[PDB]
Amino acid sequence: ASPFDTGPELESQIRNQYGVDVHVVPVLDTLNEAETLDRVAMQAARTIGPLVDSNAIIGVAWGATLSAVSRHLTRKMTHDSIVVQLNGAGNMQTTGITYASDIMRRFGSAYGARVEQFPVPAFFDHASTKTAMWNERSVQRILDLQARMSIAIFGVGSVDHVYAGGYLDEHDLTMLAADDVVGDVATVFFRSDGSSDGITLNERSTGPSHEQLRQVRRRICVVSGASKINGLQGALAAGLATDLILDEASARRLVS
Template identity: 30%
Template sequence: MYSQEEMIRVSKMYYEMQYTQKEISEKLPYSRATISRILDTAYKQGIVEVKVNYPIDFVQSMEEKIKEKYALKKVFVLPVYVDDELLILNDVGRAAAKYLHEICCDNTILGISWGTTLAHVIPHLIPKKVNDMKIVQLNGGIAKNSISTGAAQILEKFSETFSTGYYMLPVPTIVDSEMIAQVITSDSSIEETINIGKKSNIAIFGIGSVHFNNILYKGGFFKEGAYEELISKRAVGDICSRYFKEDGTLADVELNKRTIGLQLEDLQQKEYSIAVASGKSKAESVIGALNGGYVNVLFIDEVLAAEILNENNTRGKYSESG
């Protein structure tokens, strides 16, 4: 619609020379409405980039307190200036994507889960070419109904970002019986993928909360009454489709035996076990994951951080509080 020359000229006048849209319209043969559309197009085409720099001093104390309280390697707390759930999640996802760009290197094995949170990391991934890198799916990603988990798309995007292939788990994450799970995981390709996941030095995942909007519930993985039973067992969250209580222990041993993918204890051995979460409602879930020792790098927003640090909501490590 507009030439690159037009967009650059108008953008430089508006952003660098500080002319108003009215002043630009007086100097160029465009109406104010056209100036506005040119600026919008320039932004969408990447000619103009808008960057908001946040002062971070006031969240650093939160980071240090959480890091010390749960003996973590690194904590990133993102400031919240606009109370918008998607905007906050995007900020957290952007920070996690930047960190991945920094730590992924030659011979890295990167394990990834799937879900709403990981989907908000995807748009911010920064291309990086590394040698002999492997990307592996940590838990089965096929739903039992028409709901899409988005697992394949997330895996493919990570693969494109790092210019490497990937190992997929093309199976349901939760099956009907332990015997079915054993049969599926005895398949050579599935077994190989799970073993590569165990060997991954970096794992990145979201932390799911236990509510009826959860993708595992909506994906048809629970028979009638089973999810309510899980709630009654005091499950507070899941990582890689494995449910835990607030003290970090498994919420349902039988369910865990029917779950396909990385075990929670495998996360305790990772060089980088990266959890990404946002929103006050995730506090109990994140606390359970931290108490279980399944996370050593944490990306959250300041509202969630404040809730985690609230002594009315958590006593820290259960081993310390009895």
């Protein structure tokens, strides 16, 4: 093991150390964030394809990473499958609804799958709003679909103040540090040891519990950007992924 290790050698190290299947994408050390993600997203799309079948429910947690992934999907017709949105859209900036919808449409179009969206905002300002919304039939019918998902596809948020998705204000940011939060999947936060119990912000999240994710058959986790390794470490500690796609620089950090 050295700083000269090849992609395949890094895959072996991550497989053995973290117990997930992994694809390390070789990327020029000097490429920018967007271009690096584009290349990670291409490999992720290639990996996702074989895992999408007919008569299946595919859960997608939308975000910047998943948007890139959705642009690289290879057409592969299935029948009787559904793609379900795992987290809400529309934040305090009035951003997200179109973007999230476009992601879901790309997935639906690539696979000939019916699209099921989640009529809830990106995140809640108040836990009492979540409580209320989770008693709505319109919401519950989607929660039920999510519970039946065959595969889950997601990126990882990372706390290194502002946070990905633009749904938290500054005070919320101080809470995360208070609870040793390092990142999120589908807007559900976790600590460095992967734990997610007793996190105040999680009562305002629209995403599936980590317990629910861990019961899904295949969980495809896509990460780009080495400076976000804290989030990935936590997600792996939480056992959220079965399959991981990430860039070379991030993989080198991960084996460090």
